[PDB]
Design a protein around this nucleic acid. Structure first.
Ligand SMILES: [Mg+2]
Ligand SMILES: [Mg+2]
Ligand SMILES: [Mg+2]
Ligand SMILES: [Mg+2]
Ligand SMILES: [Mg+2]
Ligand SMILES: [Mg+2]
Ligand SMILES: [Mg+2]
Ligand SMILES: [Mg+2]
Ligand SMILES: [Zn+2]
Lengths: 81, 87, 185, 129, 208, 150
RNA sequence: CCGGUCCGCGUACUGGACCCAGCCGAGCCUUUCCUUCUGGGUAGCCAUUUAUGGCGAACCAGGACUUUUACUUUGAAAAAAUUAGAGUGUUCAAAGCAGGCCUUUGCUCGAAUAUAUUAGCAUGGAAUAAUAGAAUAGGACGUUAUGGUUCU
């Protein structure tokens, strides 16, 4: 391809690129509001969390760290902030 | 190229590639000159009246001639929504 | 006139301060208009019959205005019709020292001309946030900025932007173009 | 490591122009790169170019029009006296009638023809033709 | 630009899909990427036939610009395309090259069938590589029917279609012949039904 | 890349373009500071405080909220460690290898790795002396290293 | 733009550009000023008592301070011979710095000018490349801000 709009890449192909290889690098992670099944308390949790986050009310583990995104425990529903 | 008195001492002002603006040499036998007929409102081809493009042999060798014509013809209206600037 | 932080305020500044001593009547926003003050009201004429109204605020007082600016502009636009209201902070620009100039204290970056023009370019579009800036260098020699705004809270500014471009041109002399790439359109 | 961002920028431009591309992306940007590009744009060797702000060194997109034969840096930026400019243009330029040697002088970045006009000299910075 | 009468009509679009023209090869080269609409879950790539139609119209306009109709050479080394190119030459007056292409036909001026076409049209760049290769020696532009795996080297105008289909090859050639005659004025207008049927131009086995 | 390897990995964080706090963030610039000091007294290094902040409190960046980087806040409250955190972890790793080496004398691989870690200590300690983070007479001693980190 | 004249594109000379644009400058304003210090000296401010109240920048000449470089412009300096080079019928030339005039009880062009280059000296500029500065503030301004401790 000799002629191509480098300033306006297709957003579909722009999203398949590595996170450092976009026009402006941008994280693909986000923050979530996690509802444990036991109670109702807003707890902001990073998507790629490295910590076993526990809610303040009961010392129950909300998520377990993995290689990438943290894994939410059963009965826990997340909503992206 | 011309002298001080203004006479064009240059012989053979050469052609240039429509895609890359390179000079098409006198022995570049991979270079072609596309001639495309004009069509009147009746759907008939107008005799002896053409849109002309020239491509250097370099562009044709890389296989970009097809994509260059898609772009060049769309800008001149010979084509619609076939070539996209953004990929 | 106590609202104005400048000696000999103009009639327009008094009228604006007269509005400022009237929006606290409704108690939803009253607990915060007592400390609010401003230094100047610069007004220029934009095309289309509208006029741009620039409220100049002490930089330390900027974050207090940011808490009620969304509401306060809407009623100030009601009180003064055919007026586009923006709030700018009076940042100070320190000239670049010459080589032979006598040594002064090191100039902080917030006082540089590049930072201040970037700062006023940020106060202009306050409800929205800038998600990217580009600068075109045209073949003629002139340079044009492009600022990309977030679609969130876009309705507060989406009918202006043209006032900002001429207002930014008035303050700095350079050309800018505001575009919101992610509208519904 | 990355020792000359101007050399990386011009190399990218050369590779895109030699391969027939009409646009090239440059990273990182700098003032010297922008002022070098402005001289090239001023003489018509490139078209419009665009600066992208990423709260970092930056990126540049240059539009190429096929008139550029070669642009390059001279590393290091040798000190050039006024009497030495003639010798440099002979070695680097294809003819005495076109082409420019780019210098960085205390009067600013400019081509060798402009440098003779304002009678200034500095360090050599690159060339274009 | 172009009159709306040159747009893809629903009748022709039905023909193209029924002839499996839209089926492109599994693997697509980078140069043919703009012509792919979407990949089918089995693996086949769906050809954007709207782009296919416009290249056909563009290609026919180039053919009409050649003064001598015999100076246009239509080629096919595949057996599936040999009947199509022979009938195209009869209808349009072009010069058909079916089957084997003798090496040296364009460069060696003492061969028997030494031709000097102003334009070479190819059914498949892969199986007609010899015809395409010599055209790059004597300044001959090339129009090629290209699949998603067909090479694009020294091809100026590419018609995106299915090269490995019995009906795909015949239909595209029939469409070019009709449009070339429409531009020449042989067909009165773009709505008159053509006498020739796309069944003619289709390869027939020795069984029949 | 990779000063002490042949690796060419590029994995790292990519900061967002926005330098302002997200609209949904409600904590004040103070509440973060008391949170940082509370965690710093538990013994966490600045890296670990930042990990906990985004992981459990939604603090994407401490700088975009408070205005200062995490180590800058600790140094402003007299909570800055004497040894910088990264230099501490290099010395601690060097201590661990040296402790393993005295019991496994034939582990020539650990001897090679120990040289890399210690070379990395000296380059970093020399840098910290030029920026007056360490005293000009500060020197890393293998014999007394266990005192500094243990 | 009379190209008369000067001495036939000629076209140099040059009355006349009316300057198209372009090129080399200089100031002023845009938040952008040697902080100064002593006069001149005071002219206009703040002229209610002036060049009898308080415009030292209203331009000089006499003082006081100053982040360090690198770089580049210009200038002085770098002996003569040699080199390049202007002039000059040593009969030409290599050379030489001679020489030329109607013929002289004397008249009279000259004996240029360039180059030196690292180091040193003076100078314009401030791109490029470094360097210093306000972080436990022991930081900057108060021109006439208030005292105190010392020192000349
Ligand atoms: Mg109230
Ligand atoms: Mg130009
Ligand atoms: Mg050489
Ligand atoms: Mg030249
Ligand atoms: Mg050129
Ligand atoms: Mg790397
Ligand atoms: Mg190494
Ligand atoms: Mg990192
Ligand atoms: Zn819970």
């Amino acid at each position: 391809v000799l002629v191509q709009d480098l300033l306006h890449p297709s957003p579909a192909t722009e999203a398949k690129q590595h996170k450092l290889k976009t026009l402006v690098q941008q994280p693909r992670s986000f923050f979530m509001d996690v509802k444990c099944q036991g109670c109702l308390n807003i707890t902001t949790v990073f998507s790629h969390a490295q910590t076993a986050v526990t809610c303040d009310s009961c010392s129950t583990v909300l998520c377990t760290p993995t290689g990438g995104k943290a894994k939410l425990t059963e009965g826990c529903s997340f909503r992206r902030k | 190229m011309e002298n001080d008195k203004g006479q064009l001492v240059e012989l053979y002002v050469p052609r240039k590639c429509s895609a890359t603006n390179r000079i098409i040499k006198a022995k570049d036998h991979a270079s072609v000159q596309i001639s495309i007929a004009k069509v009147d409102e009746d759907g008939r081809a107008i005799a002896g009246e053409n849109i002309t493009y020239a491509l250097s042999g370099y562009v044709r060798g890389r296989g970009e001639a097809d994509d260059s014509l898609n772009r060049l013809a769309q800008q001149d209206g010979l084509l619609k929504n076939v070539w996209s600037y953004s990929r | 006139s106590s609202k104005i932080l400048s000696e000999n305020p103009t009639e327009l500044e008094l009228k604006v301060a007269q509005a400022f001593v009237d929006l606290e009547s409704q108690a939803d926003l009253k607990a915060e208009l007592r400390p609010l003050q401003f230094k100047s009201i610069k007004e220029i004429d934009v095309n289309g019959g509208k006029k741009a109204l620039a409220v100049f605020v002490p930089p330390p007082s900027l974050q207090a205005y940011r808490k009620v600016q969304t509401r306060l502009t809407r009623e100030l636009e009601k009180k003064f019709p055919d007026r586009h209201v923006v709030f700018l902070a009076e940042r100070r620009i320190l000239p670049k020292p010459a080589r032979k100039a006598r040594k002064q204290q090191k100039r902080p970056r917030s006082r540089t001309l590049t930072a201040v023009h970037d700062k006023i370019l940020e106060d202009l579009v306050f409800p929205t946030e800038i998600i990217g800036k580009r600068v075109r260098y045209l073949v003629g020699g002139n340079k044009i900025q492009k600022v990309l705004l977030d679609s969130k809270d876009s309705t507060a500014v989406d009918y202006k932007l043209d006032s900002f471009q001429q207002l930014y041109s008035k303050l700095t002399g350079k050309q800018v173009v505001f575009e919101i790439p992610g509208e519904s359109h | 490591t990355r020792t000359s961002v101007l050399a990386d920028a011009l190399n990218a431009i050369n590779n895109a122009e030699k391969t027939g591309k009409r646009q090239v992306l440059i990273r990182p940007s700098s003032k010297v790169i922008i002022k070098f590009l402005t001289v090239m744009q001023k003489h018509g060797y490139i078209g419009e170019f665009e600066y992208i702000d990423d709260h970092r060194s930056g990126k540049i997109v240059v539009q190429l029009n096929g008139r550029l034969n070669k642009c390059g840096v001279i590393q290091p930026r040798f000190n050039v006296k006024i009497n030495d400019i003639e010798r440099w243009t002979d070695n680097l330029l294809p003819a005495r009638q076109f082409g420019y040697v780019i210098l960085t002088t205390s009067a600013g970045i400019m081509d060798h023809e402009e440098a003779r006009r304002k009678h200034v000299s500095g360090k050599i910075l690159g060339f274009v033709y | 630009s172009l009159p709306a009468s040159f747009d893809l009509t629903p009748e022709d679009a039905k023909l193209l899909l029924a002839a499996n023209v839209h089926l492109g090869a599994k693997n697509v080269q980078v140069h043919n990427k703009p012509y792919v609409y979407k990949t089918r879950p089995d693996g086949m790539n769906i050809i954007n036939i709207g782009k296919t139609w416009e290249k056909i119209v563009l290609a026919a306009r180039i053919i009409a610009a050649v003064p001598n109709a015999s100076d246009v050479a239509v080629c096919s080394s595949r057996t599936f395309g040999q009947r199509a190119v022979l009938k195209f030459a009869a209808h349009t007056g072009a010069t058909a090259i079916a089957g084997r292409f003798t090496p040296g036909n364009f460069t060696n001026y003492i061969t028997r069938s030494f031709k000097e076409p102003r334009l070479v049209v190819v059914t498949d760049p892969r199986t007609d590589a010899q015809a395409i290769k010599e055209s790059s020696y004597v300044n001959i532009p090339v129009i090629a029917l290209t699949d998603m795996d067909s090479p694009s080297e020294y091809v100026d105008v590419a018609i995106p279609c299915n090269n490995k289909g019995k009906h795909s090859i015949g239909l595209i050639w029939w469409l070019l012949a009709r449009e070339v005659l429409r531009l020449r004025g042989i067909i009165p207008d773009r709505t008159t039904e053509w006498s020739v049927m796309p069944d003619l131009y289709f390869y027939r086995d020795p069984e029949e | 890349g990779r000063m002490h390897s042949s690796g060419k990995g590029i994995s790292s964080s990519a900061l967002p373009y926005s330098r302002n706090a997200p609209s949904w963030f409600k904590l004040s610039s103070d509440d973060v500071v008391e949170q940082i000091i509370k965690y710093a007294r538990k013994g966490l290094t600045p890296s670990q405080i930042g990990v906990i902040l985004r992981d459990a409190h939604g603090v994407s960046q401490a700088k975009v909220v408070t205005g200062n980087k995490i180590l800058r806040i600790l140094k402003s409250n007299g909570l800055a460690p004497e040894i910088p955190e990264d230099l501490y972890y290099l010395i601690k790793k060097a201590v661990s290898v040296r402790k393993h080496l005295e019991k496994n004398r034939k582990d020539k691989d650990s001897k090679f790795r120990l040289i890399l870690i210690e070379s990395r200590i000296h380059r970093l300690a020399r840098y910290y002396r030029t920026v007056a983070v360490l005293p000009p007479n500060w020197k890393y001693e293998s014999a007394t290293a266990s005192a500094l980190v243990a």
